[PDB]
């Protein structure tokens, strides 16, 4: 029993800033396991960022390092992704996921860079 709500997606211009919020209801955010994924229309779903449960240790892929920061908002039960210095190939459907067994990936938040 768990549900996923993604918010903040929209159409942006190259090099702006935006924050995506992936709401959680059945697993506490950054408390068991957290994960963020993306997928282009024709492509395979790809990892971008992740959070480890307790120590707030975060890692980012090579092509995305130093530009996005993903946070832990325990106050409102939400995970944020802070995207900075956007580039056009960052246009894809974004998701968050977990690998615990409470459930799986939810739905998408469309982010397009022009």
């Amino acid at each position: 029993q768990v549900q996923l709500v993604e918010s903040g997606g929209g159409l942006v211009q190259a090099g702006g800033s935006l924050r995506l919020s992936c709401t959680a209801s059945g697993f506490p955010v950054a408390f068991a396991q957290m994960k963020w994924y993306r997928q282009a229309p024709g492509k395979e779903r790809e990892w971008v960022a992740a959070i480890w449960s307790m120590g707030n240790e975060t890692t980012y892929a090579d092509s995305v390092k130093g530009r996005f920061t993903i946070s832990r908002d325990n106050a409102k039960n939400t995970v944020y992704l802070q995207m900075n210095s956007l580039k056009p190939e960052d246009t894809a459907v974004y998701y968050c996921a977990v690998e615990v067994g409470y459930g799986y990936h939810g739905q998408g938040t469309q982010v397009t860079v022009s």
């Binding site: 506490p28 408390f31 307790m54």
Partner: protein
């Protein structure tokens, strides 16, 4: 350490065991069977028969001597009588040592089984009842905070899993009762038997010394009562040899294949895997309890992770219910200590050492004391027969 049958058990077990009709009967230990009982009373009656033959020899020789060297043989009879008392003292002491070793091993098994059962009951009650009460309190205070109620339901589910996997363990209530009954019966029989044999040895030494006293000097009229007491102790010694031989044969038939007998006695009360695990330690194999203990410890670790995170990530949002969250963590770590103790009690070595000690005790010490008591009975019968058949000896005129 390992158990193997020593030579004397093999020698005694090979002794024939037949019924009153001389029919061969399965020699496997089974006291419930009437046929095995009749087989051992067959040896009892054989001992009675040779006792009767020996008395017939005494009466015939006495009447032959009366109707129709000597003092050295009388002194020798006294000496072998004293040696018999000494050997019997040693044998009775060894048999008592074996019986007390068996009682101590049974008591150790009782304590280790009662510890397992007490830990099982305490952990089950603690977890289920107290954790559910506390968790209801947290759900009361943590209301309208979703993820916290989900984690609360998660720890409740893990508690249910712990309860199931912990109840899925043997419950040694009837086994504890059987061990207690065996210990009390062994204590009663052993104490009364030791008293009886000590009295017999005292009477043997007394009659030997006081019968030699008459032969020595002073009054000679004692010899009539000395003869009467010697005959009484002679028949008593024959009965003692009968009983000792029967008990030794039964104990040897038990000791040749003790594992099979124990495994086929505890067939319904105890599971087969558990008994085969305790009797034969599975150093190469896998402990049957391993899966349940693994699930127990995995669930406890998950509880500890969730509760520690809750303590660290719920002070600002609520600032309350931490007074019993510390309590639930204390309960969990006490249960962790209980788990360590439980996996230290269900280990094969703990009960296996007690069982091997009981086996060594019974077989080695008890049955060597038994054949030594039989040897005492044999020497006592020999010396008694010689001193009774020493003759009137002019009635010491």
């Amino acid at each position: 350490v390992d158990y193997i049958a020593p030579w004397w058990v093999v020698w005694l077990h090979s002794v024939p065991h037949v019924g009153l009709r001389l029919q061969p009967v399965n020699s496997t230990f089974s006291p419930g069977d009437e046929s095995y009982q009749e087989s051992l009373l067959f040896l009892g009656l054989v001992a009675a028969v040779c006792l009767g033959l020996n008395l017939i020899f005494l009466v015939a020789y006495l009447v032959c001597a009366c109707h129709c060297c000597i003092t050295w043989t009388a002194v020798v009879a006294g000496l072998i009588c004293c040696a018999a008392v000494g050997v019997g003292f040693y044998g009775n002491s060894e048999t008592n040592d074996g019986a007390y070793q068996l009682m101590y091993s049974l008591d150790d098994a009782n304590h280790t089984f009662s510890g397992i059962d007490a830990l099982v009951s305490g952990t089950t009650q603690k977890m289920k009842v107290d954790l559910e009460q506390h968790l209801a309190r947290l759900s009361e205070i943590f209301a309208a905070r979703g993820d916290y109620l989900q984690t609360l339901k998660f720890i409740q589910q893990m508690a249910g899993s712990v309860v199931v996997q912990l109840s899925g363990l043997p419950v040694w209530r009837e086994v504890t009762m059987e061990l207690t009954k065996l210990s009390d019966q062994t204590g009663y029989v052993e104490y009364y038997r030791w008293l009886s044999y000590l009295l017999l040895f005292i009477l043997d030494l007394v009659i030997c010394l006081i019968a030699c006293l008459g032969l020595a000097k002073r009054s000679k009229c004692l010899l009539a009562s000395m003869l009467c007491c010697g005959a009484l102790s002679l028949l008593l010694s024959w009965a003692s040899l009968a009983a000792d031989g029967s008990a030794a044969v039964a104990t040897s038939d038990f000791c040749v294949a003790p594992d099979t007998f124990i495994l086929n006695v505890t067939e319904g009360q105890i599971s087969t895997e558990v008994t085969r695990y305790y009797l034969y330690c599975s150093q190469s194999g896998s402990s049957p309890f391993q899966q349940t203990l693994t699930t127990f410890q995995r669930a406890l670790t998950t509880m500890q992770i969730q509760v520690a995170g809750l303590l660290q990530f719920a002070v600002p949002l609520f600032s309350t219910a931490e007074e019993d969250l510390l309590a639930i963590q204390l309960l969990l770590n006490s249960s962790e200590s209980s788990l360590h103790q439980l996996t230290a009690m269900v280990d094969c070595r703990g009960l296996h050492k007690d069982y091997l000690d009981a086996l060594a005790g019974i077989c080695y010490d008890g049955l060597q004391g038994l054949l030594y008591l039989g040897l005492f009975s044999f020497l006592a019968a020999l010396a008694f027969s010689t001193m009774i058949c020493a003759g009137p000896r002019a009635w010491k005129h």
